[PDB]
Amino acid sequence: KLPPGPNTPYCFDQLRRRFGDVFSLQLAWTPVVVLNGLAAVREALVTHGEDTADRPPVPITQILGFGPRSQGVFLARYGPAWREQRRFSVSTLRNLGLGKKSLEQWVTEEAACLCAAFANHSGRPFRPNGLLDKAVSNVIASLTCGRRFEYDDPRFLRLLDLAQEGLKEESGFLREVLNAVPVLLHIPALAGKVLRFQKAFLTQLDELLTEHRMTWDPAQPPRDLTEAFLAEMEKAKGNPESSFNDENLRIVVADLFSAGMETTSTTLAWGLLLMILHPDVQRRVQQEIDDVIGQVRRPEMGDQAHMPYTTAVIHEVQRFGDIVPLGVTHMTSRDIEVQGFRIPKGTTLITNLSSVLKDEAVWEKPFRFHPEHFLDAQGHFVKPEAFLPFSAGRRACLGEPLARMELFLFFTSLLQHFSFSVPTGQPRPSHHGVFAFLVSPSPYELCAVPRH
Ligand code: HEM
Ligand SMILES: CSc1ccc2c(c1)N(CC[C@H]1CCCCN1C)c1ccccc1S2
Ligand SMILES: CSc1ccc2c(c1)N(CC[C@H]1CCCCN1C)c1ccccc1S2
Ligand SMILES: [Zn+2]
Ligand SMILES: [Zn+2]
Ligand SMILES: [Zn+2]
């Protein structure tokens, strides 16, 4: 028995209440099943984990150097190419985060830089989005190339702008056209234009990787992910089965920027917004900051386990902000069943994470901003199983530990040194997002006033 069935996230909400948690659609020329609520998402991605970890093919990635051992991680098919890069990135992130604690130090320094760029606005109103973008990009640059960029660096601005444009290309009529029917990529006028900006983004990274190649000291342990990768590539010369090759290096690095920039930055943008709309919550986080850390010392990760309210608030920013509502598509390898219905092999799965984060049977007030969603009456932090902003299963976000570190360190450092407020004489910003692959706060401005 197949599932029933006839911007986007609201239409899927209505379709849920019509046909239920597991329903069918036939978009482009593609069979889709949408999954709603914890139980269907969990059943598909965990219980049937082994047969839902594949990605729908994407013909136009042909343009970006994709091949059987050059698929990067994000859109790579389930198989050894995916699995080798997934293990590499996971363990590289673990290693860089242990011993010397390099990632934590890079994030701590970027938070200091980010506070200074906030101070220099001197209590005049401003949109914080651009600065959040830069801070979070520098964390990726640190992870992947072992450097940061000055916030006024022109190359950095260029890399950022190209990245923003190349996210737009991910959601295009054009893009879906050649993707859905790929034989029109023989026409050079079409092919050259779909991923114009992504190619330029990739060209700018190539330039950075070339520089990094020159300064790499292979006589020392790798100090960042690209070095670790380059070391593996050397061991793999003469092995055509390896995914450690120059064509894949640039896709892996570009996947890490693509997946880890706008998500983390947009989440922080939600957090500041929710802090000026809910100044009472802001002050109570500032209370816990002062009482656990002080107004002087830089926040460290070891603080987080003693700050259940700030942890609650950050979790609630993620749940309410709901920045990846329809997740990232999967594809079924074998046939499976979910909530009774049968799902044939080759079906594109859409995981409706928003329906998990906003399930009315799980959360007390799913459409309000409410830190007590993660607090018990004693004030202990609790994390409900429906907290899945990173999805679940084999393909669940590999950057989650770095994002948790970034959200806590950037968010607490900022509220440690500033008070945020709607600027006098402007409308209360809306708390409704704008969907465009990611859900972002409506554009808003704020005042950052130092606290000492
Ligand atoms: C709040 C911040 C973030 C959120 C909400 C987020 C969310 C997600 C989601 C929903 C997925 C889809 C998982 C699926 O296929 O079901 C994903 C995958 C992924 N994310 Fe994140 N992400 C965040 C930050 C990051 C960071 C900082 C990095 C890199 C350092 C990163 C790298 C990746 C990669 C490489 C994948 C694909 C994993 C795979 O296909 O094996 N993300 N993320
Ligand atoms: C600024 S280019 C950009 C920005 C944000 C995202 C993505 C691309 N990608 C694909 C990553 C791509 C990067 C170029 C090399 C090949 N790989 C696969 C993506 C795909 C599907 C859902 C979400 C996302 S997040
Ligand atoms: C890749 S990660 C990701 C995460 C959420 C969505 C999408 C992709 N897609 C692809 C759905 C796809 C199914 C097969 C036929 C063509 N259609 C678009 C999408 C694209 C544009 C608007 C909304 C959405 S929902
Ligand atoms: Zn390096
Ligand atoms: Zn308790
Ligand atoms: Zn200060």
Curated annotation (Swiss-Prot):
Cellular location(s): Endoplasmic reticulum membrane; Microsome membrane
Membrane topology: Peripheral membrane protein
EC number of the protein: 1.14.14.-
Effect on the protein upon substituting residue 58 to A: In allele CYP2D6*88
Keyword Heme: yes
InterPro entries noted in UniProt: Cyt_P450 (IPR001128), Cyt_P450_CS (IPR017972), Cyt_P450_E_grp-I (IPR002401), Cyt_P450_E_grp-I_CYP2D-like (IPR008069), Cyt_P450_sf (IPR036396), Cytochrome_P450_fam2 (IPR050182)
Top-level taxon of origin: Eukaryota
Effect of residue 250 to C: In allele CYP2D6*2, allele CYP2D6*12, allele CYP2D6*14, allele CYP2D6*17, allele CYP2D6*45A, allele CYP2D6*45B and allele CYP2D6*46; significantly reduced monooxygenase activity toward anandamide; slight decrease of monooxygenase activity towards bufuralol
Key word Transport present: no
Effect after changing residue 115 to S: In allele CYP2D6*91
Pfam families: p450
Biochemical pathway: Cofactor metabolism; retinol metabolism; Lipid metabolism; fatty acid metabolism; Steroid metabolism; cholesterol metabolism
Main location: endoplasmic reticulum
Substitution effect: residue 191 to S: In allele CYP2D6*33
Keywords linked to the UniProt accession: Cholesterol metabolism, Endoplasmic reticulum, Fatty acid metabolism, Heme, Iron, Lipid metabolism, Membrane, Metal-binding, Microsome, Monooxygenase, Oxidoreductase, Steroid metabolism, Sterol metabolism
Reaction it catalyzes: (5Z,8Z,11Z,14Z)-eicosatetraenoate + reduced [NADPH--hemoprotein reductase] + O2 = (8R,9S)-epoxy-(5Z,11Z,14Z)-eicosatrienoate + oxidized [NADPH--hemoprotein reductase] + H2O + H(+); (5Z,8Z,11Z,14Z)-eicosatetraenoate + reduced [NADPH--hemoprotein reductase] + O2 = (11R,12S)-epoxy-(5Z,8Z,14Z)-eicosatrienoate + oxidized [NADPH--hemoprotein reductase] + H2O + H(+); (5Z,8Z,11Z,14Z)-eicosatetraenoate + reduced [NADPH--hemoprotein reductase] + O2 = (14S,15R)-epoxy-(5Z,8Z,11Z)-eicosatrienoate + oxidized [NADPH--hemoprotein reductase] + H2O + H(+); N-(5Z,8Z,11Z,14Z-eicosatetraenoyl)-ethanolamine + reduced [NADPH--hemoprotein reductase] + O2 = N-(8,9-epoxy-5Z,11Z,14Z-eicosatrienoyl)-ethanolamine + oxidized [NADPH--hemoprotein reductase] + H2O + H(+)
Induction: By pregnancy.
GO cellular component annotations of the record: cytoplasm; endoplasmic reticulum; endoplasmic reticulum membrane; intracellular membrane-bounded organelle; mitochondrion
MF (Gene Ontology): anandamide 11,12 epoxidase activity; anandamide 14,15 epoxidase activity; anandamide 8,9 epoxidase activity; heme binding; iron ion binding; monooxygenase activity; oxidoreductase activity; oxidoreductase activity, acting on paired donors, with incorporation or reduction of molecular oxygen, reduced flavin or flavoprotein as one donor, and incorporation of one atom of oxygen
Cofactor needs: heme
GO biological processes: alkaloid catabolic process; alkaloid metabolic process; arachidonate metabolic process; cholesterol metabolic process; coumarin metabolic process; estrogen metabolic process; isoquinoline alkaloid metabolic process; long-chain fatty acid biosynthetic process
Assigned protein family: Belongs to the cytochrome P450 family.
Function: A cytochrome P450 monooxygenase involved in the metabolism of fatty acids, steroids and retinoids. Mechanistically, uses molecular oxygen inserting one oxygen atom into a substrate, and reducing the second into a water molecule, with two electrons provided by NADPH via cytochrome P450 reductase (NADPH--hemoprotein reductase). Catalyzes the epoxidation of double bonds of polyunsaturated fatty acids (PUFA).
PANTHER family: CYTOCHROME P450 2D6-RELATED, CYTOCHROME P450 508A4-RELATED
Entry protein name: Cytochrome P450 2D6
Biological source species: Homo sapiens (Human)
Gene: CYP2D6
